[PDB]
Structure formats: structure tokens, C-alpha cells
Amino acid sequence: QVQLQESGGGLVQPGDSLRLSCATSGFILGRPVITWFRQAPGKEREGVLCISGSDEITYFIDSVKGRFTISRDNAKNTVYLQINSLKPEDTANYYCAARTFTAGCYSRSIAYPYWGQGTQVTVSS
Amino acid sequence: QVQLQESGGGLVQPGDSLRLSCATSGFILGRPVITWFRQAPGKEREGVLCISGSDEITYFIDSVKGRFTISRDNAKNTVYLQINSLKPEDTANYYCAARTFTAGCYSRSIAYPYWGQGTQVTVSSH
Amino acid sequence: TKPFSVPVLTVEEMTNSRFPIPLEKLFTGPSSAFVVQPQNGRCTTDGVLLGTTQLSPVNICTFRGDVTHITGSRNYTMNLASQNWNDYDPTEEIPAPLGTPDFVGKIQGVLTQTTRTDGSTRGHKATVYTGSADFAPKLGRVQFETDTDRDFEANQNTKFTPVGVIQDGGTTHRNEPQQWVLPSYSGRNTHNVHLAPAVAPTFPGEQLLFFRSTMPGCSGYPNMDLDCLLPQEWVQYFYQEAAPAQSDVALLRFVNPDTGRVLFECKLHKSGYVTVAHTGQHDLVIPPNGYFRFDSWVNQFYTLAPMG
Amino acid sequence: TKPFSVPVLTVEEMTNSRFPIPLEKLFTGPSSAFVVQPQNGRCTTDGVLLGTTQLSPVNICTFRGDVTHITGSRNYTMNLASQNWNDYDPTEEIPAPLGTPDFVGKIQGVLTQTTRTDGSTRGHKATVYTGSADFAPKLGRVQFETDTDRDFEANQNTKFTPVGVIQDGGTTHRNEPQQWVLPSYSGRNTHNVHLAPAVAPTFPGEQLLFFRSTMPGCSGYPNMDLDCLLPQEWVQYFYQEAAPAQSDVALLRFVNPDTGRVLFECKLHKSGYVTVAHTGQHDLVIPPNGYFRFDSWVNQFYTLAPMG
């Protein structure tokens, strides 16, 4: 019965750092694939980066490499997105999404049956 | 390329007899189930009687059982319907239908993939 | 005459036995509160089909027959044939024709028809409401709501191909279908007959394990969850192997062939359902290549390793 | 050393491997005039899947993905996912996604969609023309004609469920589909790759034996004949058993289980097709309970008992 809840967004300053959380529940046995997506008000949800149940990490957007970091806190059933040095192009509603499988880091939204409700990140102008 | 063709109809006299034939081609191995249907004015095609590949006969209309006889001539790939003592109620367009199975005599038209084009039997008023 | 086994197939390689769609996941939850009595996907481990179960995945929730309607009506009554177009016999000791839907809801699909004299064809949107008083497949008749009041012919071969389910968006979301509510197969007329039995865990701390898919939705806000007790491929496999049951319970292990490791164990009951040692409503998270493997026949009070 | 066999299933118990519908009959005909190279229903007798062949019959001629509207039309481009919604990889060594149609024609069905935020759903009549320049499943793109220019949303899960085939009734009847004409899987951007090979009888006086169905027709006067080289259940069974081929030719007898009488014998070739000794275009007339039985591996010189 997977459930996903994002937190950590808000109005933030260019150049600062930010940690988002994806708290999960409703699953047993393996560790699910978890992917962060983001949506701008005139675009669709786009895949950003993914971590498998074995902690293998796949990036889907080259530009965020080396500012965005994904990690897993198994003890809290929580996955984090760490953004260093916020830029205005990072502004979006951020979602986490999950699959009921331990492997398979996919970039497209249709690959994920479960989604949180989103947490807004606005890098102020 | 299976083909069925009915023949033997016409304008016929009450109390006479007639013989319809259903000639088939396009089948190998088993002898197919063949059923005679008829379509009287204003009605749908209705199943009359059937002969299995083993020549087991099933009637679907009880009133015809005294006077209608179905039979198979394997060597001429034909099945016949003989009607004795023709009566006006016999009047209809008569069709034969086949299945690619040796067994299963069914009364409904949808059970048969293969059909002839029909032969008309009219038991005349004069 | 091999020992009893289950097929080497992953979850995603297998098919729901209650609607013609792939499996997606394994789900466990308590079920003491409602009746679990599906009629499709029912088979003993030694290959006896039960309920309305038949072997073809593609015939699940399909109907075949010929149709009539009242003049000017968009509703067509289908006089059912068997799945191979044979005459349908209502005295057979089954609940309804094999593959008949086994839940109350509104299934949308397409009614197709061929005219036998010339090979002309036609297709129309069609919905069957399995809770309707006119849903009487055990008597040989069901009604379809269609988008035509004139474009079907009588006495011509006609087929319903299912696609998905619908819901009335003007009412509480996900209130239908009701996958655990059986239709009345003879209409308002009499009670259901020859049913596969209701199932429930009996060992303390056990729950059923469900093989789960998401049905397509065609309109509204339907509840698209669909749980079966056995993959269709396990029905097919048990029918084919017909290995005698040496006790009432076969112990299976779910194996990750990527590592060799056993992820969990479960009980396959000889009457055809699976239980696990778990309390809670949880999705199982699995390796994509994982599969089930027979380990041994066990006695009646074997205790599974707990999961979740 | 594991013994080979085929399933104990009647013709009517089995499923076409090239469209999701039951088998109806056995047919034999000459085939030197055209190329027999289907890509679904292809499997060796020791269980190696070939072509676009996958295991469950409900995925045959289905597509999944998301859709983008083609402005000024009722047409949509599907960006394909794999059959389990995984990202699709065009560098996989297959001709196209497994289950892609393997003939040129117009397949009508229903495109359904769910909006993930609220569970709202929708469905529309849709046709895929697999001879289209815009039929490019190997590249991950397939065009559908629909009855809407506005209702589908972008980036949402969308499925095509096949129902049947159509034909233009103003043109020569039964002129399409063309079941032995392969599509261009890359929409003519490049040639087809990784195909299962064309098949032809090589032994004097032999013809292929076809497992035949009648596809539903949805409009017009289509050619509804559909022939596969192996039933889907034989593909499924050989994949499970993986029994080694002791020669290139397995001798099968078709038997009546009431009497033990053999109706005919045929050759099942190791690379996955069947031949009989017969000249001409004929339907086989069979007992409904008849089934195929593997009797012996035989060498390349074995002469079948003639039929017909």
C-alpha cells in the first residue's frame, strides 16, 4: 500500500542549499526504486535523478550533476534530495515517485505508479 | 477454400417428395458435421436437423421427424435431405452449414462457420 | 510424472486470471471483513478447474453469441454461446459460462459482428453492467448498452471484447467496481450455484497473498485494483501437470535469481490460494527477476517465516 | 536427457500467437507464392523465443506509453514504453517491442488513459495503420487515428487494447489486412533487424500446417484469416520445459483420446514450425477432443504418412 510524502520546500535564496525529504510507507521486503521529478507551471513532470534499492544512482538531467545529490536513510524509510547552490532554474514543484521493484531506474513518469503530492521550491528573484 | 452448395429446390407439389443435396469441397481428414437450416418468410434461419461425422442424427424440430431424412454420401462429399409427403409448412429457403469438427450437432446458426447460398423450396398452392 | 512445481515465471511475465491484463505486483492485506470468493482464477494444485475458470487468458470477461434489441433501443440482449460458439447448456454444473465476469461493476469494451452472407463487419462501443437485473449469464442472456440503435443484425456472430471499467464521476470516487462482490448470475431470479468456495486464512497471523493488476479505466473515477488468487499461468500449469497433492499445503519460496537468495516463503494451499505470515496492508517490493519455487510439502500447522 | 513433449491441449483450448484470440481450426496450403516470416509465435522446440515473441497472449498487439496530439488532426503519436511500463530501449537486439503487430493492416481498438493526480479516466476508439510511414515501434513511436482532437492529456499513462481489423468497403473485398506482409518496424528510417527467419517446407510434397483463427472485424470487408506457426501455449510450454532437441525434427501424431486412433502425423521442426504431407488448400476436419502427441525424434529423411 505504498504512500509517499515530500517535505522541505519553500521560498529560498539563490546560492543557498536545500534538503528535500521523501518519507515512504506501505511496503515490505525489498527497498523500492525512488525517483525525484520536478514540474514547472508550464511544463510536465520531468525525471531528475533516481536511486535503486541497491543504492545505485542514475542522473536524468546532466546539468544538475554535482549540485544535486540523492541518498537513502533506510532506518527512517526516507530518501533525500540535497541541492547545493540553488539557481533560479531549479524553481519547480518537486515530486518523489516509487516502483514496487528493487531495480529499474527509469526517467519517464509513466514508469511510476506511486507519487507524493509535491513540495514547491521557489528560488526568489 | 471451403465451399458448400445446395441444390434440389423448386416449386413442388404437396404430397410429392424431394431430395436436397449439400455438396462440399475443401475439407480433408474427418467427415464434417453438417446441418440443414431453413428460413421461412419473415423468420431467421432456424436449425432443422444435423448429421455428425459418425452419422449420428439430431433433430431440432420435432414436427419434421416423420418426413425429413438426413444422410451422408462420403464418396461424393455430399449430404442429403429427403422430404416425403411435402406439406405447405415445409416452404422455406433451405441452407446447409458445416463445422470443421467431426462431432457437435448444434442448433444455432452462429455455431457454423461455413454456409451455402441456399435453395428455395415452395410447396405450391396450384 | 515429475514432483509438484510452479512455473519459472516472474510476476511481470504472468497474467491476471480475472481480467485479460498482466500482473503488476504482489499485495497482502487482511480480509476478515469481507467475503473473498472470486470465480475466475480458481484451480486446485492438482489441476481441477473451479468456478467459472477456463484456460485461455484472452477469454476472460469475453462474451460470444447473437443479439437482438427492442426497436429503437441502444440496449442489445446477447443470447450467449459457449466460448467456442457451441450451444450453451444452462444445466451444466457451473455458476455461469466459463470466463463470465466475477465482480459487480460496469465493464466497457467493443461489440463486434460479422454478417455471414457477405463478410461485412461492424463494431460499437458497449458496456455491460454486471449488477443489472438483465445480467443473467447463467440463464444464457446478458444486456449491453451500446452507442447504436440500429447497426446490429439478428442471428449473426457477435463478440464482446473487454477493455476496462467505468465509474459515475458524479458520485464518490472509486466506489465501483466492487471486485469482491459476486454478480447474481441468474438475474434477480435465484441464488448462485456451483461456486468455488470463499477463501480465508486459518492459521494465526496469516493473510492472503494477492496477485494484483490495475484495470484500464474508460470513464469516471473507477477503482481499478484487481486481485486474483492464482496467476492465470499457474491455472494453466496445474491443469497441464496434474501432480497429486501430497499434503494440504505446498511450501513455496520466492527466489531472486540475481543473488540466489530467498526473499520470503508462503503457503500454496491445495485448493488454490496463497497465504503469508504478515499483519498489515502492504505492497511487496520485489526484484524484477524474482520467481516462485516449490520447496516441499508441509503439514497443516507449519509456521511460515514472518514477513514485513 | 530431459524428454521433449507438447501440451495435452485441444485446438479449441489454445490461443493464436499473432493476435489475442482463440484458435479455431487447422489449415494447410501451399506457400511458395509469398514469404512466410511472422515475428510473433516464434520459438524453438528447446524454448528459445525468436522475433518479437513474448509469453502472455494478452500483450499481443497491445501498446503502452504516453501520447502527444498532432495539431489540426484527430491523430496522436504514442511514445512507447515497454510492456511493463519500463523505459523502452531501441538498442535491444529485437525487431521491435515484444508483441508488436507483425502484419500490415488497420487494427482497431481502444486507447485508454488515466490521469495520475486524481484517478480520472477516459477511452476513445482508435486505429493503428501498421503500413503507415508513422508506424515506427522499433524507434518507440506509433501513430493512432482517434475520434478526438482534445481529450487525451500529455505525460499520462495510455494503453491501446486491440479488438479487430478493418477494410475500406469501397475497394475490393478482403484486400486487407495482408497477414504475410511484415511492417517496416522503423517506419522506413532503416531496414528491419533481428528477424526470425522466413519458413518454407523443404521436403518433397510437404506443406506448412497453420493454426488458424478468425480475427474480429470492426468495419468494412476485411480478410479475417490469421495463421500462426505455433499456438501461444506451445511457445509458453517450450519456454518452460527447455527440453533439448535430439534431432532437427520431432514426429507428432494427432490422436483421439477416446479411441487412441491416430488421425494424422506431422513434423514439428526444431526451429519452430509444423509441416504435413499434402498438396492443396484444405481445412482439416478434426475431433473436438483431439490433441497432438510427441512420439519420436526422426532424422532428415523421414517421410510422413500422406493426408488429404
In angstroms, the first-to-last Cα distance of chain B is 42
**Contact check, Cβ <8 Å, A44/D65:** no
Cβ D92 vs Cβ D183: under 8 Å: no
User: Mutating which of A4, A29, A51, A52 best tests the C interface, going by the most C Cβ atoms within 10 A?
Assistant: A29
Identify the domain boundary among D121, D148, D166. D166
* Yes or no, beta carbons of B29 and D25 under 8 Å apart: no
Please report, as a single letter, which amino acid is at residue D114: T
Contact criterion met (CB below 8 Å) for D143 and D67: no
Q: Residue D2 burial by CB count (10 A; 0-12/13-18/19+): exposed, middle or buried?
A: exposed
In terms of CA atoms, which chain C residue is nearest residue A100? C285
SS (H, E, C) C245-280: CCCCEEEEEEECCCCCCEEEEEEEECCCEEEEECCC
Say yes or no for a CB contact (<8 Å) between B30 and D286: yes
In a domain, C127, yes or no: yes
Query: Which residue in C has a C-alpha nearest to residue A31's C-alpha?
Result: C285
For C154, which residue in chain B has the nearest alpha carbon? Answer: B44
Residue in D36, D30, D18, D92 with CA at minimum distance from that of residue D279:
D30
- What resolution (Å)? 1.6
For residue C175, tell me if it sits in a domain.
no
Rounded CA gap, A112 and A2, in Å? 11
Name the CA radius of gyration of chain D, rounded.
21
Chain A residues inside the 8 Å CB shell of D87: 106-108, 111
Rounded to whole angstroms, the Cα distance separating A7 from A19 reads 9
Work out how many CB contacts closer than 8 A connect B with D.
Answer: 54
B115: helix, coil or strand?
Answer: strand
- Other CB atoms within 10 A of residue B85 CB: 11
For residue D263, the enclosing domain spans 25-53+196-298
CB C282 within 8 A of CB C28: yes
Contact D285 B2 (CB under 8 A): no
**Would you call the peptide bond into A14 cis, given omega within 30 degrees of 0 as the criterion?**
no
Quick check: C284 and A32 CB within 8 A?
no
- Pick the residue from chain B with its C-alpha nearest to C82: B111
Q: What is the largest CA-CA distance in chain B?
A: 46
Asked if C66 lies within 8 A of B115 by C-beta distance, the reply is no
Alpha helices in chain A (DSSP H): none
The owner of cell 498489515 is C280
For residue C219, the cross-strand partners are: C166, D122
Q: Cα(D177)–Cα(D180) distance, rounded to whole angstroms?
A: 9
Residues of C in contact with B108 (CB under 8 A): 66, 79, 81, 87
Query: Which residues of A are less than 8 Å from D155 in CB distance?
Result: 44-45, 109-110
Assess if residue C188 is contained within a domain: no
Could you tell me which of A50, A98, A95 has the C-alpha nearest to residue A71? Answer: A50
Residues of D in contact with B1 (CB under 8 A): 281
Q: Distance between CA atoms of C30 and B43, rounded to whole angstroms?
A: 56
Amino acid present at D179:
Q
Nearest Cα residue in chain B from C84: B111
Tell me which amino acid residue D138 is: K
Using CA atoms of D239, D243, D248, D251 in order, give the dihedral in degrees to the nearest 10: -100
Residue with cell 441468474: C186
- Note whether C153 and C115 are within 8 A (CB): yes
At D223, list the grid cell.
480478410
* Domain final residue, candidates C166, C185, C210: C166
Verify whether the Cβ–Cβ distance C155 to B104 is below 8 Å.
no
Cell reading at D39: 515475428
Residue D285, judged by CB atoms within 10 A of its CB (0-12, 13-18, 19+), counts as buried
Domain count, chain C: 2
A110: nearest CA partner in chain D: D157
- Residues in A touching C210 (Cβ below 8 Å): none
Are residue D65 and residue D162 in the same domain, yes or no?
yes
The stretches of A55-99 forming alpha helices (DSSP H) are none
Closest by Cβ to D25, choosing from B1, B53, B100: B100
Question: Is there a contact between B81 and B72 (Cβ–Cβ < 8 Å)?
Answer: no
Residue C176 lies in a domain: no
What are the beta bridge partners of residue D285?
Answer: B29
Separation of alpha carbons C136 and C87, rounded Å: 16
Cβ-defined contact of A1 to C281 (cutoff 8 Å): yes
Residues D41 and D94 in one domain: no
Give the C-alpha separation, C263 to C285, whole Å.
10
Helix (H) or strand (E) holding B92: strand B92-98
Please check whether residues D156 and D66 belong to one and the same domain: yes
Query: In terms of residue numbers, what domain contains A58?
Result: 3-123
Contact B110 C154 (CB under 8 A): no
Query: Grid coordinates representing D27?
Result: 489449415
Query: Which residue from B124, B100, B122, B125 is spatially nearest to B111, judged by alpha carbons?
Result: B100
User: Which residues does D48 contact at the CB level (< 8 Å), separation at least 6?
Assistant: none
Report CB contact under 8 Å: C66, B45: no
Q: How many CA atoms lie within 13 A of C142 on its CB side?
A: 32
How many angstroms separate the CA atoms of C41 and C56, rounded? 11
Per DSSP, C139 falls in state G
The CATH number of the domain where C141 resides is what?
2.40.30.120
Q: Which residue of D has its CA nearest to C236?
A: D233
Distance from the Cα of D282 to chain B's closest Cα (Å) equals 5
Are the beta carbons of A29 and C264 separated by less than 8 Å?
yes
Between helix C232-241 and helix D232-241 the angle, nearest 10°, is: 70
Phi, psi dihedral angles at C210 (to 5 degrees): -115, 140
AA identity, residue C243: A
Which residue in B110, B114, B117 has the most chain C C-beta atoms within 10 A of its own C-beta, making it the best mutation to test that interface?
B110
Cα end-to-end distance, chain A, whole Å: 40
Mark yes or no for CB contact B110/C155 under 8 Å: yes
Point out the residue among C8, C57, C167 whose CB comes nearest to the CB of D56.
C57
In a domain, C64, yes or no: yes
- Name the method of structure determination: X-ray
CA pair distance C199, D212, nearest whole angstrom: 39
Q: CA of A35: how far to CAs of A39, A72, C24, C186, in Å?
A: 13, 11, 19, 49
Return the residue matching grid coordinates 453469441. Answer: C65
Contact D174 C119 (CB under 8 A): yes
Same-domain pairing of C116 and C214: no
Do residue D56 and residue C14 have CB atoms under 8 angstroms apart?
A: yes
Is A in contact with B (3 or more beta carbon pairs below 8 Å)? no
How close, in Å, is residue D11 to chain C by CA atoms? Answer: 10
Interface of A with C (CB under 8 A): 1-2, 26-32, 53, 100-104, 113
CATH number of the domain encompassing residue C229: 2.40.510.10
D17's grid cell: 500467437
> Is the same domain home to C124 and C91?
yes
Whether residues C225 and C291 fall in one domain: yes
Distance from CA of D56 to the nearest CA of C (A): 7
At B36, which helix (H) or strand (E)?
strand B34-39
As a whole number of angstroms, the distance between CA A104 and CA A109 comes to 13
Chains that touch D (3 or more CB pairs under 8 A): A, B, C
Q: Are residues D132 and D206 part of one domain?
A: no
Quick one: D68 and D159 in the same domain? yes
Per the CB < 8 A criterion, the answer to whether C303 and C281 are in contact is no
Minimum distance, in Å, between the CA of residue C194 and any CA atom of chain D: 22
The closest CB to that of D85, out of A45, A107, A110, belongs to: A110
> What span, in angstroms and rounded, lies between the C-alpha atoms of A106 and A59?
10
- Residue C120's CB is within 10 A of a number of other CB atoms, namely 19
- Interface probe for D, chosen from C1, C24, C56 (most Cβ of D below 10 Å), is C56
Of C87, C116, C117, the CB nearest to B106: C87
Nearest to D53 by CA among D15, D100, D98: D98
Same domain (yes/no): C47, C98: no
Q: Would you call C122 and D221 a contact, using CB atoms and an 8 Å cutoff?
A: no
* Residue in D closest to B26 by C-alpha: D282
**Whose CA is closest to D89, among D52, D138, D122, D32?**
D138
Helix or strand holding residue D107 (H, E): strand D106-114
Contact D87 A109 (CB under 8 A): no
Residues C64 and C122 in one domain: yes
Q: Which of C63, C86, C153, C159 to mutate to test the interface with B (most CBs of B within 10 A)?
A: C86
**Within this chain, do residues D29 and D64 fall inside the same structural domain, yes or no?**
no
Cell numbers for C150: 440500429
- C210 and C278 co-located in one domain: yes
Domains in chain A, number: 1
